[PDB]
Amino acid sequence: RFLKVKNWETDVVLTDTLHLKSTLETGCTEHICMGSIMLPTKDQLFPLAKEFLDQYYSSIKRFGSKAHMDRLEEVNKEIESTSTYQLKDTELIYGAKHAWRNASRCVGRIQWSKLQVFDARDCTTAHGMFNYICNHVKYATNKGNLRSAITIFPQRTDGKHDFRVWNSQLIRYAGYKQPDGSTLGDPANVQFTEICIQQGWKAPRGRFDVLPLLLQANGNDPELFQIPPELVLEVPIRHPKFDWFKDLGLKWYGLPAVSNMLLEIGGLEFSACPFSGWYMGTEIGVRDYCDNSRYNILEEVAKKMDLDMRKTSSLWKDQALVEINIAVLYSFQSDKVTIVDHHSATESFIKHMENEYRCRGGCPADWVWIVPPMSGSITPVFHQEMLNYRLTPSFEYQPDPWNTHVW
Amino acid sequence: RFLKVKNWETDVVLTDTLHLKSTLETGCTEHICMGSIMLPVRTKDQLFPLAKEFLDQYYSSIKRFGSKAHMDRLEEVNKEIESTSTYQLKDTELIYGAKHAWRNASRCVGRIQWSKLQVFDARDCTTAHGMFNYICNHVKYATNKGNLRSAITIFPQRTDGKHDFRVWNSQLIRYAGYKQPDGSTLGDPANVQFTEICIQQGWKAPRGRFDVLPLLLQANGNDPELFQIPPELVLEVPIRHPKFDWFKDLGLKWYGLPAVSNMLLEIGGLEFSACPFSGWYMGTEIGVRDYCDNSRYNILEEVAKKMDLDMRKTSSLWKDQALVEINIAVLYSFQSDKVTIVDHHSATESFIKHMENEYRCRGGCPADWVWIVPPMSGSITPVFHQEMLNYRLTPSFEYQPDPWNTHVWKG
Numbered sequence: 001r002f003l004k005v006k007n008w009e010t011d012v013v014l015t016d017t018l019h020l021k022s023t024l025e026t027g028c029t030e031h032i033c034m035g036s037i038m039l040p041t042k043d044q045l046f047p048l049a050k051e052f053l054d055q056y057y058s059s060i061k062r063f064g065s066k067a068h069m070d071r072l073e074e075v076n077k078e079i080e081s082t083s084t085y086q087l088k089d090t091e092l093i094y095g096a097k098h099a100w101r102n103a104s105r106c107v108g109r110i111q112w113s114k115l116q117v118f119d120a121r122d123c124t125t126a127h128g129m130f131n132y133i134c135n136h137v138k139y140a141t142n143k144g145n146l147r148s149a150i151t152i153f154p155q156r157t158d159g160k161h162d163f164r165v166w167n168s169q170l171i172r173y174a175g176y177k178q179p180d181g182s183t184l185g186d187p188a189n190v191q192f193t194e195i196c197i198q199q200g201w202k203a204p205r206g207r208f209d210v211l212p213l214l215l216q217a218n219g220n221d222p223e224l225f226q227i228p229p230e231l232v233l234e235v236p237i238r239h240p241k242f243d244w245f246k247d248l249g250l251k252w253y254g255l256p257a258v259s260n261m262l263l264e265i266g267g268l269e270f271s272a273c274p275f276s277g278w279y280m281g282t283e284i285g286v287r288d289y290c291d292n293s294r295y296n297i298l299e300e301v302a303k304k305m306d307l308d309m310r311k312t313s314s315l316w317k318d319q320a321l322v323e324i325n326i327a328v329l330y331s332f333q334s335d336k337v338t339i340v341d342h343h344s345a346t347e348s349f350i351k352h353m354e355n356e357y358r359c360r361g362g363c364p365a366d367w368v369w370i371v372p373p374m375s376g377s378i379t380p381v382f383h384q385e386m387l388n389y390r391l392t393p394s395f396e397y398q399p400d401p402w403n404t405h406v407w
Numbered sequence: 408r409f410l411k412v413k414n415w416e417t418d419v420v421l422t423d424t425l426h427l428k429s430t431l432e433t434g435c436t437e438h439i440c441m442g443s444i445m446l447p448v449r450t451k452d453q454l455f456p457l458a459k460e461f462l463d464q465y466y467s468s469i470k471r472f473g474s475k476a477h478m479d480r481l482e483e484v485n486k487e488i489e490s491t492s493t494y495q496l497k498d499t500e501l502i503y504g505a506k507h508a509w510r511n512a513s514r515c516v517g518r519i520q521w522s523k524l525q526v527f528d529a530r531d532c533t534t535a536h537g538m539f540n541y542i543c544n545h546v547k548y549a550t551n552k553g554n555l556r557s558a559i560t561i562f563p564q565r566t567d568g569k570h571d572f573r574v575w576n577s578q579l580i581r582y583a584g585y586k587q588p589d590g591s592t593l594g595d596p597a598n599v600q601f602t603e604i605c606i607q608q609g610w611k612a613p614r615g616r617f618d619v620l621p622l623l624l625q626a627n628g629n630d631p632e633l634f635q636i637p638p639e640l641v642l643e644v645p646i647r648h649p650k651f652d653w654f655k656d657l658g659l660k661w662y663g664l665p666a667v668s669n670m671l672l673e674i675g676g677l678e679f680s681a682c683p684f685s686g687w688y689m690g691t692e693i694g695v696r697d698y699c700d701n702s703r704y705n706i707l708e709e710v711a712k713k714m715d716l717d718m719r720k721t722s723s724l725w726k727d728q729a730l731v732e733i734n735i736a737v738l739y740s741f742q743s744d745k746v747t748i749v750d751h752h753s754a755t756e757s758f759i760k761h762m763e764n765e766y767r768c769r770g771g772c773p774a775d776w777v778w779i780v781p782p783m784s785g786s787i788t789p790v791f792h793q794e795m796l797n798y799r800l801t802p803s804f805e806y807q808p809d810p811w812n813t814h815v816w817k818g
């Protein structure tokens with residue numbers, strides 16, 4: 001019931017008790033592990049509220065205080081009356097930071113307590129949402145000195161007045177299918193690139209077109225908005241050794257801002273809560289550039305390096321992958337845009353893990369996601385045993401809006 | 408109940424029914440996943456149904472389920488159990504068992520090869536000298552002058568737990584590791600503790616960088632004995648790089664035959680505590696893990712210096728760069744010497760085909776993503792994007808504690 005995790009490179013052993021406070025389900029059973037599966041009313045509400053307020057008031061050293069008891073009293077009143085309740089700003093901020101702190105798949109959590117929270121619960125329209133989103137982008141970007149931020153729109157009421165950002169990220173490049181057969185731009189965004197066009201967007205049908213925002217307020221039909229180009233910081237990609245690299249004509253944006261997740265706090269659901277930090281190099285160079293179902297330019301780059309692409313055993317893909325990732329990092333660093341390499345980030349995470357075991361009794365961590373997509377075993381997280389479990393507040397997945405929206 | 412797994416790169420969806428045949432526990436619960444945990448004297452009482460379940464499996468595979476041969480065998484085993492408290496497997500059953508233990512090894516990416524396994528029955532063995540002979544023959548057969556052949560040698564099963572056969576070595580062929588008084592390590596750091604035991608047992612160490620360790624062999628629960636593998640049986644490969652001439656001067660080499668010898672083979676409730684098996688290497692095992700793990704030979708820096716890389720900031724990815732070239736050199740050396748090896752792209756590509764075939768013909772393929780994904784260049788191999796289900800089927804290979812921690816010493 002008290003679980004131990006071992007690091008095999010250092011022999012360090014941590015003891016986890018935090019998992020006992022876990023409440024949601026993993027998808028695993030004692031007969032089967034699902035660790036590599038990507039996607040596994042009033043009476044329901046008050047225990048959920050109670051649980052949250054319990055941990056909040058414990059965190060400020062007023063567990064069992066009159067304020068705690070009164071707040072519990074007040075929230076219970078509000079629930080029986082209104083069939084929901086509203087979070088105080090302090091509780092909202094706490095809940096957002098803790099959803100990040102609890103995100104078992106995030107390697108960047110050493111930063112969790114420095115999150116800038118923007119309360120947008122007074123928002124009523126898509127133009128309103130647009131304004132808040134623009135403010136978020138400008139603040140987070142900070143001319144290249146990136147700052148973590150989340151903007152929180154009004155909570156779900158009854159599933160009919162949902163606020164939703166339809167983009168998966170605030171900033172992404174368009175993808176177009178050809179008659180020629182292949183794909184121009186980003187293949188992951190083909191379906192969304194088409195819905196925007198199916199909606200009125202006029203595409204420059206280029207290789208790297210910044211997608212428009214598609215914003216849904218209060219359950220209404222979503223509207224297109226173009227993000228002011230001066231708010232979208234981009235980094236041209238060059239290599240510090242290969243002069244022909246620049247000629248490839250690649251660039252990427254500095255701000256990773258995830259916008260399709262659901263934030264759960266005290267039973268309350270925030271369906272629109274775009275958040276942003278800064279990139280780890282491999283998200284762009286390994287996943288975005290080199291994935292087969294994405295920009296997939298490994299071959300192109302290998303050619304210009306004139307590697308023997310004859311047999312897989314020359315490891316030409318491995319060689320190209322590395323140079324690319326060197327370029328991504330070189331480019332952002334040169335341009336004073338915040339980026340972290342996978343070595344630094346995983347080293348930071350090990351330190352964060354040890355902090356959390358110390359000050360909290362554990363740290364839920366999903367190895368399958370924490371270990372980077374290249375050079376896995378030369379990073380310290382590879383040799384680290386991790387326990388995965390779900391804590392709340394939390395970020396959850398939710399269905400794509402176009403599959404659900406009562407149109 | 409039916410379970411779906413998706414390949415996110417191809418959108419191929421597969422359906423698993425085989426997991427229903429699973430009995431053994433995973434470690435996971437509904438509230439925790441222990442997916443990344445490395446490591447998560449039997450009575451006639453529980454032996455009966457274990458035997459029966461194995462025999463049901465075996466007779467189904469040969470399409471004789473419920474036959475008179477099936478039923479008689481069941482009666483024969485049942486009688487042997489209540490009489491002698493254990494039982495003996497037929498040769499056919501033993502071969503089926505060993506092959507299926509491999510087929511079921513969810514952490515093994517080489518399983519496309521599972522049906523081609525040479526099974527050596529060493530159950531008539533009684534002494535350590537006899538164990539040495541069987542192991543020598545295994546190594547000679549498996550090596551085959553570089554044209555590697557998968558093999559397993561199986562020693563007598565456990566009885567009362569007091570007469571165990573054990574190979575004390577973790578692998579049949581490994582290099583010694585020596586801790587120096589100045590805190591540094593000569594040879595393979597992973598083998599320091601085992602090297603000490605050998606030396607204590609009387610092994611005269613040459614105390615070099617690549618000394619092949621002696622075999623420490625325990626028959627019938629007796630104290631283990633030292634044997635040196637004849638050097639002509641130990642195929643080794645000098646590591647060079649195809650473009651870098653300075654690489655040979657690093658002085659590296661590795662042995663050709665990976666042969667794991669510390670696992671336990673469970674078949675029909677019987678436990679085979681000594682069952683060394685061998686295949687051939689995936690290049691990254693040597694190049695990534697053996698040479699580049701910080702806890703092993705750890706030659707990354709020396710290689711990076713000789714490449715004249717920017718070693719000042721990790722963001723130069725000097726470590727990643729050196730890692731690739733070391734792995735290129737490993738593959739190049741083995742191919743040049745015509746010693747069987749597989750790169751991680753070929754091996755993972757083959758595993759995917761195997762897994763798809765298994766889902767079709769068998770209803771599933773237990774697979775441990777954490778171990779199947781290779782230790783470098785993970786996302787550019789097809790297994791990275793493959794969802795996998797991990798569960799435990801018998802027959803199986805299991806971990807067991809190191810013998811030096813459990814052995815009762817005789818003298």
Ligand code: HEM
Binds near residue numbers: 100109111148277
């Ligand atoms: C500040 C620098 C940050 C870094 C370097 C970072 C790093 C990462 C990386 C590499 C992943 C895996 C992404 C993928 O492979 O698709 C991830 C996932 C995730 N991140 Fe972080 N992150 C940062 C900030 C944040 C912030 C500010 C939040 C929320 C407030 C957050 C919440 C999450 C969540 C919920 C996931 C997993 C989503 C899922 O379940 O699929 N991260 N992070």
Ligand code: HEM
Binds near residue numbers: 517778804
């Ligand atoms: C024929 C070529 C083979 C290849 C290329 C191969 C490849 C691999 C690799 C790369 C691993 C991971 C090892 C590690 O990272 O420590 C592994 C694990 C494993 N292999 Fe295979 N293997 C082969 C043959 C065999 C054979 C013949 C057997 C048994 C008869 C076997 C049984 C296992 C088992 C039980 C594991 C898991 C060990 C553990 O859980 O720690 N393999 N294999």
Ligand SMILES: CNCc1cccc(OCc2ccc3ccc(N)nc3c2)c1
Binds near residue numbers: 108256261276280283
């Ligand atoms: C495509 N992978 C599935 C999927 C679906 C929805 C969200 C998501 O999040 C990835 C994610 C989330 C937060 C991040 C924060 C910072 C960062 N550099 N990357 C981050 C990446 C991942």
Ligand SMILES: CNCc1cccc(OCc2ccc3ccc(N)nc3c2)c1
Binds near residue numbers: 517665667670689
């Ligand atoms: C060091 N990791 C823990 C541990 C403990 C005991 C055995 C073992 O086996 C790894 C293993 C097992 C079988 C293999 C077969 C072929 C091969 N190329 N590598 C193989 C590697 C691994």
Ligand SMILES: C[C@H](O)[C@H](O)[C@H]1CNc2nc(N)[nH]c(=O)c2N1
Binds near residue numbers: 386444
């Ligand atoms: C903590 C973690 O389970 C451990 O380091 C594992 C990770 N994946 C692995 N994968 C393989 N193939 N071999 C290993 O030894 C390991 N080690």
Ligand SMILES: C[C@H](O)[C@H](O)[C@H]1CNc2nc(N)[nH]c(=O)c2N1
Binds near residue numbers: 036037370793794795
């Ligand atoms: C099949 C597998 O679950 C899928 O490819 C996962 C694996 N690990 C990952 N790890 C990270 N960080 N991000 C991902 O998108 C994925 N994808």
Ligand SMILES: [Zn+2]
Binds near residue numbers: 032439440
């Ligand atoms: Zn699990």
